[PDB]
PDB file of all heavy atoms in Angstrom:
ATOM      1  N   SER L   1      17.041  -1.256  13.379  1.00 62.60           N
ATOM      2  CA  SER L   1      15.719  -0.882  12.808  1.00 62.60           C
ATOM      3  C   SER L   1      15.574  -1.521  11.433  1.00 62.60           C
ATOM      4  O   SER L   1      16.571  -1.791  10.762  1.00 62.60           O
ATOM      5  CB  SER L   1      15.579   0.641  12.739  1.00 62.60           C
ATOM      6  OG  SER L   1      15.429   1.192  14.040  1.00 62.60           O
ATOM      7  N   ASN L   2      14.330  -1.769  11.028  1.00 58.42           N
ATOM      8  CA  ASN L   2      14.044  -2.575   9.843  1.00 58.42           C
ATOM      9  C   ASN L   2      13.033  -1.926   8.923  1.00 58.42           C
ATOM     10  O   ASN L   2      12.045  -1.349   9.380  1.00 58.42           O
ATOM     11  CB  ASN L   2      13.491  -3.938  10.257  1.00 58.42           C
ATOM     12  CG  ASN L   2      14.372  -4.641  11.258  1.00 58.42           C
ATOM     13  OD1 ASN L   2      15.540  -4.924  10.986  1.00 58.42           O
ATOM     14  ND2 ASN L   2      13.819  -4.924  12.432  1.00 58.42           N
ATOM     15  N   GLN L   3      13.271  -2.052   7.621  1.00 58.31           N
ATOM     16  CA  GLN L   3      12.292  -1.656   6.622  1.00 58.31           C
ATOM     17  C   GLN L   3      12.125  -2.767   5.597  1.00 58.31           C
ATOM     18  O   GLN L   3      13.107  -3.235   5.019  1.00 58.31           O
ATOM     19  CB  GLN L   3      12.713  -0.371   5.919  1.00 58.31           C
ATOM     20  CG  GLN L   3      11.641   0.189   5.001  1.00 58.31           C
ATOM     21  CD  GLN L   3      12.127   1.390   4.233  1.00 58.31           C
ATOM     22  OE1 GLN L   3      13.025   1.278   3.397  1.00 58.31           O
ATOM     23  NE2 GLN L   3      11.548   2.551   4.513  1.00 58.31           N
ATOM     24  N   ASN L   4      10.877  -3.183   5.391  1.00 61.57           N
ATOM     25  CA  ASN L   4      10.513  -4.099   4.315  1.00 61.57           C
ATOM     26  C   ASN L   4       9.733  -3.331   3.263  1.00 61.57           C
ATOM     27  O   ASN L   4       8.723  -2.699   3.577  1.00 61.57           O
ATOM     28  CB  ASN L   4       9.639  -5.239   4.834  1.00 61.57           C
ATOM     29  CG  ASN L   4      10.403  -6.224   5.692  1.00 61.57           C
ATOM     30  OD1 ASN L   4      11.535  -6.599   5.378  1.00 61.57           O
ATOM     31  ND2 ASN L   4       9.774  -6.667   6.776  1.00 61.57           N
ATOM     32  N   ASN L   5      10.205  -3.401   2.022  1.00 61.57           N
ATOM     33  CA  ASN L   5       9.582  -2.725   0.896  1.00 61.57           C
ATOM     34  C   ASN L   5       9.134  -3.773  -0.103  1.00 61.57           C
ATOM     35  O   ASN L   5       9.926  -4.274  -0.904  1.00 61.57           O
ATOM     36  CB  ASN L   5      10.579  -1.753   0.283  1.00 61.57           C
ATOM     37  CG  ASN L   5      11.141  -0.812   1.315  1.00 61.57           C
ATOM     38  OD1 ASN L   5      10.394  -0.071   1.952  1.00 61.57           O
ATOM     39  ND2 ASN L   5      12.450  -0.863   1.524  1.00 61.57           N
ATOM     40  N   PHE L   6       7.859  -4.133  -0.017  1.00 59.79           N
ATOM     41  CA  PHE L   6       7.314  -5.210  -0.826  1.00 59.79           C
ATOM     42  C   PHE L   6       6.985  -4.743  -2.240  1.00 59.79           C
ATOM     43  O   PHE L   6       6.778  -3.547  -2.491  1.00 59.79           O
ATOM     44  CB  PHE L   6       6.082  -5.808  -0.149  1.00 59.79           C
ATOM     45  CG  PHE L   6       6.395  -6.572   1.110  1.00 59.79           C
ATOM     46  CD1 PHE L   6       6.265  -5.976   2.360  1.00 59.79           C
ATOM     47  CD2 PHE L   6       6.832  -7.887   1.044  1.00 59.79           C
ATOM     48  CE1 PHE L   6       6.557  -6.685   3.520  1.00 59.79           C
ATOM     49  CE2 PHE L   6       7.125  -8.602   2.197  1.00 59.79           C
ATOM     50  CZ  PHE L   6       6.986  -8.000   3.437  1.00 59.79           C
TER      51      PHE L   6
ATOM     52  N   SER I   1      21.102  -2.876  11.212  1.00 59.08           N
ATOM     53  CA  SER I   1      19.779  -2.502  10.641  1.00 59.08           C
ATOM     54  C   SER I   1      19.634  -3.141   9.266  1.00 59.08           C
ATOM     55  O   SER I   1      20.631  -3.411   8.595  1.00 59.08           O
ATOM     56  CB  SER I   1      19.639  -0.978  10.572  1.00 59.08           C
ATOM     57  OG  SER I   1      19.489  -0.428  11.873  1.00 59.08           O
ATOM     58  N   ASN I   2      18.390  -3.389   8.861  1.00 57.57           N
ATOM     59  CA  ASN I   2      18.105  -4.195   7.677  1.00 57.57           C
ATOM     60  C   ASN I   2      17.093  -3.546   6.756  1.00 57.57           C
ATOM     61  O   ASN I   2      16.105  -2.969   7.213  1.00 57.57           O
ATOM     62  CB  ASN I   2      17.551  -5.558   8.090  1.00 57.57           C
ATOM     63  CG  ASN I   2      18.432  -6.261   9.091  1.00 57.57           C
ATOM     64  OD1 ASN I   2      19.600  -6.544   8.819  1.00 57.57           O
ATOM     65  ND2 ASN I   2      17.880  -6.544  10.265  1.00 57.57           N
ATOM     66  N   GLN I   3      17.331  -3.672   5.454  1.00 55.64           N
ATOM     67  CA  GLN I   3      16.352  -3.276   4.455  1.00 55.64           C
ATOM     68  C   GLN I   3      16.185  -4.387   3.430  1.00 55.64           C
ATOM     69  O   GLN I   3      17.167  -4.855   2.852  1.00 55.64           O
ATOM     70  CB  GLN I   3      16.773  -1.991   3.752  1.00 55.64           C
ATOM     71  CG  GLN I   3      15.701  -1.431   2.834  1.00 55.64           C
ATOM     72  CD  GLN I   3      16.188  -0.230   2.066  1.00 55.64           C
ATOM     73  OE1 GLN I   3      17.085  -0.342   1.230  1.00 55.64           O
ATOM     74  NE2 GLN I   3      15.608   0.931   2.346  1.00 55.64           N
ATOM     75  N   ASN I   4      14.937  -4.803   3.224  1.00 54.93           N
ATOM     76  CA  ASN I   4      14.573  -5.719   2.148  1.00 54.93           C
ATOM     77  C   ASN I   4      13.793  -4.951   1.096  1.00 54.93           C
ATOM     78  O   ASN I   4      12.783  -4.319   1.410  1.00 54.93           O
ATOM     79  CB  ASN I   4      13.699  -6.859   2.667  1.00 54.93           C
ATOM     80  CG  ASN I   4      14.463  -7.844   3.525  1.00 54.93           C
ATOM     81  OD1 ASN I   4      15.595  -8.219   3.212  1.00 54.93           O
ATOM     82  ND2 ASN I   4      13.834  -8.287   4.609  1.00 54.93           N
ATOM     83  N   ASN I   5      14.265  -5.021  -0.145  1.00 59.64           N
ATOM     84  CA  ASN I   5      13.642  -4.345  -1.271  1.00 59.64           C
ATOM     85  C   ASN I   5      13.194  -5.393  -2.270  1.00 59.64           C
ATOM     86  O   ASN I   5      13.986  -5.894  -3.071  1.00 59.64           O
ATOM     87  CB  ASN I   5      14.639  -3.373  -1.884  1.00 59.64           C
ATOM     88  CG  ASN I   5      15.201  -2.432  -0.852  1.00 59.64           C
ATOM     89  OD1 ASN I   5      14.454  -1.691  -0.215  1.00 59.64           O
ATOM     90  ND2 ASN I   5      16.511  -2.483  -0.643  1.00 59.64           N
ATOM     91  N   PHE I   6      11.919  -5.752  -2.183  1.00 55.63           N
ATOM     92  CA  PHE I   6      11.374  -6.830  -2.993  1.00 55.63           C
ATOM     93  C   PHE I   6      11.046  -6.363  -4.407  1.00 55.63           C
ATOM     94  O   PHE I   6      10.838  -5.167  -4.658  1.00 55.63           O
ATOM     95  CB  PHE I   6      10.143  -7.428  -2.316  1.00 55.63           C
ATOM     96  CG  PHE I   6      10.456  -8.192  -1.057  1.00 55.63           C
ATOM     97  CD1 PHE I   6      10.325  -7.596   0.193  1.00 55.63           C
ATOM     98  CD2 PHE I   6      10.892  -9.507  -1.123  1.00 55.63           C
ATOM     99  CE1 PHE I   6      10.618  -8.305   1.353  1.00 55.63           C
ATOM    100  CE2 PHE I   6      11.185 -10.222   0.030  1.00 55.63           C
ATOM    101  CZ  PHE I   6      11.047  -9.620   1.270  1.00 55.63           C
TER     102      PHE I   6
END
C-alpha cells in the first residue's frame, strides 16, 4: 500500500 | 509498502 504526501 | 513525504 502507498501514501504520497505532497 | 511505500511512503513519500515531500
Side-chain angles (χ1 to χ4, degrees):
Chain L
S1 289
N2 307 300
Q3 188 185 66
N4 289 318
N5 306 300
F6 291 97
Chain I
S1 289
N2 307 300
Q3 188 185 66
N4 289 318
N5 306 300
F6 291 97

